[PDB]
Amino acid sequence: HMLRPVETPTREIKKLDGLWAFSLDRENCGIDQRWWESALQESRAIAVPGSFNDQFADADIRNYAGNVWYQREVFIPKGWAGQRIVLRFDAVTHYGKVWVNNQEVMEHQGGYTPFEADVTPYVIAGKSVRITVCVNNELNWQTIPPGMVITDENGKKKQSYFHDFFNYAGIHRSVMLYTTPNTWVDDITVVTHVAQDCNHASVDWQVANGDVSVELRDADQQVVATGQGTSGTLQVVNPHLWQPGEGYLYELCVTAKSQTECDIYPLRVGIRSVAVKGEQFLINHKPFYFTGFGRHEDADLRGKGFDNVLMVHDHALMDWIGANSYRTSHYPYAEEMLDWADEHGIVVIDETAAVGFNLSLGIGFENKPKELYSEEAVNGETQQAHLQAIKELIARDKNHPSVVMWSIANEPDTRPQGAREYFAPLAEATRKLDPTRPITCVNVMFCDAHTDTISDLFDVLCLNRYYGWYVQSGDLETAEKVLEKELLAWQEKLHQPIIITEYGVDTLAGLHSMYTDMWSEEYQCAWLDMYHRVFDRVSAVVGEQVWNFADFATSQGILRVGGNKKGIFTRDRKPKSAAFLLQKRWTGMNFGEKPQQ
Amino acid sequence: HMLRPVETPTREIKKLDGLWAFSLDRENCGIDQRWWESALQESRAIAVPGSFNDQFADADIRNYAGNVWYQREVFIPKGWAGQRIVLRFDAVTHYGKVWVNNQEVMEHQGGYTPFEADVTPYVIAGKSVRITVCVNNELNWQTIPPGMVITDENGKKKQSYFHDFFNYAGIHRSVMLYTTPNTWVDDITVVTHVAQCNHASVDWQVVNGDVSVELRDADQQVVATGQSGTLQVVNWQPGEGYLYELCVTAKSQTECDIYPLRVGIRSVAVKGEQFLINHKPFYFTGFGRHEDADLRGKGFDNVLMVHDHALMDWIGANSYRTSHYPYAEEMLDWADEHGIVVIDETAAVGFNLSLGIGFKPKELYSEEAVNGETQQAHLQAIKELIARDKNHPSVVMWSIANEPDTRPQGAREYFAPLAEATRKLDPTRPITCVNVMFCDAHTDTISDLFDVLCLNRYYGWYVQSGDLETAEKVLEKELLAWQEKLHQPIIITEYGVDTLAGLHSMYTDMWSEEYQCAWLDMYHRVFDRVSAVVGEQVWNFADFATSQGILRVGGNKKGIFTRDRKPKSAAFLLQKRWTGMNFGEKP
Ligand SMILES: CCCCCC[C@@H]1NC[C@@H](O)[C@H](O)[C@H]1C(=O)O
Ligand SMILES: CCCCCC[C@@H]1NC[C@@H](O)[C@H](O)[C@H]1C(=O)O
């Protein structure tokens, strides 16, 4: 049971603020020598939140595999003698184990979701405790995402993985201590139903030794509904709906009264209905059309570290270009992202970190498990770890009205028997963990309409298609034919709504061509344009998401010229020519509505 | 039998004055309708020499597969009534058929060598004859280099091939008309020997005329003289490059003809781990190159040659390999005449089906692919190279092919006749065949049919990508493995990494100028530790155009220079090494 921290009977002191002591451990003696005991040797200042790889311009820190130590002292605020205090890590990429002054208090696997522990017994209010963090950036076959650690003859660990983006690690987001009353709200769940768009209710179901009443206050803070019951309610309402263009928010505030002290938790709600009918995706009983991007949490110097200016600027760009939706590509994003999405009515495809369950999308000319689904590779523990990743993503983003669909994985290889054996239970478990949202699994190119094995276990079909790029390279005529043929094949086979969640081409900013050859800005424009002409001719396609909003870092190889260049913007957010192409189509269309051509 | 035209009793008018009428033939009725009848209509100006693909900024012309039509008139000069006059094409890339006013005067297959024909019976001096050329850019398994044409559903041709560089086509070189006296020399052959202050120069000046030969100096003052066959004693070095001149007089009583031909006195041979030029241990330094440049494609251009040679001289290169095809004959005149060491190579590239991109005949040596006809065309291509560059002193080694796959059974049947035959087509030059990375020491089948073996190695790039410590270990161990395994001299004909000009990194990540620098330095330190290898040639001198794909960012970016000839940081690195060593002597 987890909620995002906020105010009044609750209060934060964040240690996000500032520089920590940081150290490597090339021989992994930190645990043996109990480094959490003393203040570190060999410590250098590092900034949190932020990846550790790019911060020191050193290829050895950058390419490190192992454990790293983050440590900082802090003064525990003194008006906190009688309240309950928690230590919350909003993300520690891959694995983290924390000591609060010689006392292990938490441990976590999963680099993208928050994890907290009550630390009341282990701290002296009014004085300073020392926080030590042990961070592991290693991936094996039971981590979400999977990878393999390669140890050379000399014990240097080098991490290989099967996804594009670079394996940035560290404390990527918020680290804070926050206090709730000893009687406190611990979890909230809100569900919205709507009929003729002027007439429904907000079911609730709450959970910590406190009798609870909930007021549903206005944007004007005018109250229009009231309930009581730990097992919640159905507050019935005639309302203004949370819509894609505007995203209205009521405020449902839950009051947890114990007979002495009280706690109250403010939770914003968007009144909207999501469903799939035939080949139509409907938000509030109207067929929506998705436009926008796959994104990444990547940026210069800070890696995957959260940054407010970046969020403000990237939403300004996305707003300008006319995007209405995005997918949290290949891991759960910072919650600040989803909060922004709620206030602005941005439609979001929420996705777990389950990427790389595929051993066919390689560079060439170089020792893998020859069976993807097996005891050596993706096995039962992997499945359990995956289900737990689904449970953490859902427990954190269930109430967000902007999250409109759950993505279980991205681009697994579905051809082997055992893909369906691995995925079907996860598809079912996910539906039972949130029956109010449709479910998806993003589908790779070579698992075509004929060969794919699991897409009928999901509500929406999300395709990643690169005809004319990785195959039929340079050939816009042939690729157009292939793309039309496979889209009609998919619509014939499943009669589900189709979103093209990935389509894009590597483009060097400033490379121009009078031909329309690959890597050129002219080719990025003509290729996106040919895709758009096809989408507009297939009734089932309800959504387009250009593969990347910006250029991002990847591991080194012959396929990646300083990373992935499929961005519409450069890594410093400057637009390639295709940006204006996109802006013309996406602002020239009626909002949320499929282009009539 | 071939040699370059010159002017003392013979005379040229080049039709290289570029603007010819040019046209495509997209429904392939040109041969049927005999377009050579009339002047081509629906015609647009084109520049000759130059590839036709890039001249028009048109992607449909650029990617065309089929026949194209080149046509121009010329006024044959009237002081040409009694001499024999020849129509000479220095190269028509892939295939060419010429009409001189309906009389189809020639044909040629093989896009990198000249072909000439006497057109006296079909020409009237003092008026203009209509020249029509049909050039085909298509490749099959029986062509040099090999390829496959696949036709899509609508009769649209796509040409696929297996070499990196782009398949540029057209009239790439000189087109000249030249007139000789009716008793004329047709071929010359010269061989030079040298001992450890003195030696001889065989000749055989195959012509209808008696023979007298003058050996005039740079002063053109005489040093030996003969009268078919000789063997003359005397009493050409890399840094300096001296050239004597033998002048051939075909003396007839009816008329006379003379030919001036330059000669270089030097000896080349190998054994142990040593390649010796005039009995001295050489070290090759320099480049794999390409005939590629903006707008003109593979078209020859004098400014380009002057500038690129300034660059190679500055950076400290003493040698280059005519990568994947025979270069401009003018290239070799410059190299003879400037003392550049040239590793000469034919167009035998793409005999390999193993490292293409990701995302075909199932056995390379067989009738479906590499067959007996391929053997013939390959032998003929080897022999045309031999006939045109036999007299050039700058050629120091002949390359029979580049980067074939040696692992399938049958490579040694295809190859053995070509190595024996080619050694038998000139014992005065050593022979090599450049072998790919994946045919390593244990796996390669044929490295012993050649005098030197030349390695193209890219460890740290295509394998162990970015892993420069590990790549170092591999390069050292398999280099020593090769030295033990054949005890031949080794030249590294290819080593380089794609480098985007202006991409810089505080790490040393691939595609960065820092990475090119660090990678080349590691390779260089590796060679300094193997007594055996006597030659280093950084893979490409300049960035060049290739066919489109996910591996090539607007072409191959392994150049030391960009395509507009601007230096990456590694350029200076190379200059330091090649200027910092004593000439021809490796650290
Ligand atoms: C042949 C299949 C190619 C799949 C390649 C498409 C990949 N999908 C997942 C994304 O994270 C990658 O960046 C994208 C790519 O490589 O740019
Ligand atoms: C595994 C790759 C094997 C090396 C192949 C490297 C290629 N040699 C032949 C040249 O024509 C190519 O330019 C070179 C390359 O990279 O552009």
mmCIF file with all atom_site columns, N, CA, C and O in Angstrom, chain A residues 22-35:
data_model
loop_
_atom_site.group_PDB
_atom_site.id
_atom_site.type_symbol
_atom_site.label_atom_id
_atom_site.label_alt_id
_atom_site.label_comp_id
_atom_site.label_asym_id
_atom_site.label_entity_id
_atom_site.label_seq_id
_atom_site.pdbx_PDB_ins_code
_atom_site.Cartn_x
_atom_site.Cartn_y
_atom_site.Cartn_z
_atom_site.occupancy
_atom_site.B_iso_or_equiv
_atom_site.pdbx_formal_charge
_atom_site.auth_seq_id
_atom_site.auth_comp_id
_atom_site.auth_asym_id
_atom_site.auth_atom_id
_atom_site.pdbx_PDB_model_num
ATOM 1  N N  . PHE A 1 22 ? 29.827 9.604  -2.680 1.00 0.00 ? 22 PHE A N  1
ATOM 2  C CA . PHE A 1 22 ? 29.638 8.534  -3.641 1.00 0.00 ? 22 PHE A CA 1
ATOM 3  C C  . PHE A 1 22 ? 30.942 7.778  -3.774 1.00 0.00 ? 22 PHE A C  1
ATOM 4  O O  . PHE A 1 22 ? 32.014 8.377  -3.765 1.00 0.00 ? 22 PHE A O  1
ATOM 5  N N  . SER A 1 23 ? 30.846 6.471  -3.954 1.00 0.00 ? 23 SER A N  1
ATOM 6  C CA . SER A 1 23 ? 32.040 5.660  -4.063 1.00 0.00 ? 23 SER A CA 1
ATOM 7  C C  . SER A 1 23 ? 31.719 4.434  -4.903 1.00 0.00 ? 23 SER A C  1
ATOM 8  O O  . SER A 1 23 ? 30.589 3.936  -4.897 1.00 0.00 ? 23 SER A O  1
ATOM 9  N N  . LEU A 1 24 ? 32.729 3.938  -5.610 1.00 0.00 ? 24 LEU A N  1
ATOM 10 C CA . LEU A 1 24 ? 32.632 2.687  -6.347 1.00 0.00 ? 24 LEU A CA 1
ATOM 11 C C  . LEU A 1 24 ? 33.026 1.532  -5.419 1.00 0.00 ? 24 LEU A C  1
ATOM 12 O O  . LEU A 1 24 ? 33.393 1.752  -4.262 1.00 0.00 ? 24 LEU A O  1
ATOM 13 N N  . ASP A 1 25 ? 32.964 0.271  -5.918 1.00 0.00 ? 25 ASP A N  1
ATOM 14 C CA . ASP A 1 25 ? 33.474 -0.877 -5.137 1.00 0.00 ? 25 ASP A CA 1
ATOM 15 C C  . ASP A 1 25 ? 33.969 -1.954 -6.084 1.00 0.00 ? 25 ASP A C  1
ATOM 16 O O  . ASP A 1 25 ? 33.302 -2.952 -6.337 1.00 0.00 ? 25 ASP A O  1
ATOM 17 N N  . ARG A 1 26 ? 35.186 -1.803 -6.549 1.00 0.00 ? 26 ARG A N  1
ATOM 18 C CA . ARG A 1 26 ? 35.553 -2.562 -7.729 1.00 0.00 ? 26 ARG A CA 1
ATOM 19 C C  . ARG A 1 26 ? 35.752 -4.033 -7.367 1.00 0.00 ? 26 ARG A C  1
ATOM 20 O O  . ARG A 1 26 ? 35.409 -4.925 -8.160 1.00 0.00 ? 26 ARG A O  1
ATOM 21 N N  . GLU A 1 27 ? 36.130 -4.294 -6.106 1.00 0.00 ? 27 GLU A N  1
ATOM 22 C CA . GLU A 1 27 ? 36.311 -5.632 -5.543 1.00 0.00 ? 27 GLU A CA 1
ATOM 23 C C  . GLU A 1 27 ? 35.186 -6.074 -4.605 1.00 0.00 ? 27 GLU A C  1
ATOM 24 O O  . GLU A 1 27 ? 35.327 -7.108 -3.933 1.00 0.00 ? 27 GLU A O  1
ATOM 25 N N  . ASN A 1 28 ? 34.107 -5.296 -4.498 1.00 0.00 ? 28 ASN A N  1
ATOM 26 C CA . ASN A 1 28 ? 32.926 -5.683 -3.720 1.00 0.00 ? 28 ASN A CA 1
ATOM 27 C C  . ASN A 1 28 ? 33.287 -6.093 -2.292 1.00 0.00 ? 28 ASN A C  1
ATOM 28 O O  . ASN A 1 28 ? 32.969 -7.194 -1.836 1.00 0.00 ? 28 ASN A O  1
ATOM 29 N N  . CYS A 1 29 ? 33.988 -5.204 -1.600 1.00 0.00 ? 29 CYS A N  1
ATOM 30 C CA . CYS A 1 29 ? 34.286 -5.370 -0.188 1.00 0.00 ? 29 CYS A CA 1
ATOM 31 C C  . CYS A 1 29 ? 33.437 -4.471 0.692  1.00 0.00 ? 29 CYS A C  1
ATOM 32 O O  . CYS A 1 29 ? 33.580 -4.510 1.913  1.00 0.00 ? 29 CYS A O  1
ATOM 33 N N  . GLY A 1 30 ? 32.564 -3.660 0.100  1.00 0.00 ? 30 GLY A N  1
ATOM 34 C CA . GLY A 1 30 ? 31.771 -2.725 0.884  1.00 0.00 ? 30 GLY A CA 1
ATOM 35 C C  . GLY A 1 30 ? 30.836 -3.414 1.856  1.00 0.00 ? 30 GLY A C  1
ATOM 36 O O  . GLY A 1 30 ? 30.570 -2.905 2.943  1.00 0.00 ? 30 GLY A O  1
ATOM 37 N N  . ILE A 1 31 ? 30.240 -4.524 1.436  1.00 0.00 ? 31 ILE A N  1
ATOM 38 C CA . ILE A 1 31 ? 29.326 -5.252 2.305  1.00 0.00 ? 31 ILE A CA 1
ATOM 39 C C  . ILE A 1 31 ? 30.094 -5.958 3.425  1.00 0.00 ? 31 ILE A C  1
ATOM 40 O O  . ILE A 1 31 ? 29.703 -5.912 4.601  1.00 0.00 ? 31 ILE A O  1
ATOM 41 N N  . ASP A 1 32 ? 31.214 -6.600 3.073  1.00 0.00 ? 32 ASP A N  1
ATOM 42 C CA . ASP A 1 32 ? 32.037 -7.289 4.056  1.00 0.00 ? 32 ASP A CA 1
ATOM 43 C C  . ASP A 1 32 ? 32.530 -6.325 5.118  1.00 0.00 ? 32 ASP A C  1
ATOM 44 O O  . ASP A 1 32 ? 32.402 -6.584 6.320  1.00 0.00 ? 32 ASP A O  1
ATOM 45 N N  . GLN A 1 33 ? 33.061 -5.187 4.687  1.00 0.00 ? 33 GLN A N  1
ATOM 46 C CA . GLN A 1 33 ? 33.656 -4.212 5.583  1.00 0.00 ? 33 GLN A CA 1
ATOM 47 C C  . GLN A 1 33 ? 32.620 -3.281 6.173  1.00 0.00 ? 33 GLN A C  1
ATOM 48 O O  . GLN A 1 33 ? 32.989 -2.270 6.779  1.00 0.00 ? 33 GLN A O  1
ATOM 49 N N  . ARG A 1 34 ? 31.338 -3.587 5.957  1.00 0.00 ? 34 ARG A N  1
ATOM 50 C CA . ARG A 1 34 ? 30.205 -2.839 6.486  1.00 0.00 ? 34 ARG A CA 1
ATOM 51 C C  . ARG A 1 34 ? 30.454 -1.344 6.361  1.00 0.00 ? 34 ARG A C  1
ATOM 52 O O  . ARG A 1 34 ? 30.646 -0.660 7.364  1.00 0.00 ? 34 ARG A O  1
ATOM 53 N N  . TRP A 1 35 ? 30.503 -0.836 5.127  1.00 0.00 ? 35 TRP A N  1
ATOM 54 C CA . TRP A 1 35 ? 30.799 0.578  4.929  1.00 0.00 ? 35 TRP A CA 1
ATOM 55 C C  . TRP A 1 35 ? 29.708 1.468  5.501  1.00 0.00 ? 35 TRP A C  1
ATOM 56 O O  . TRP A 1 35 ? 29.974 2.627  5.842  1.00 0.00 ? 35 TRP A O  1
#
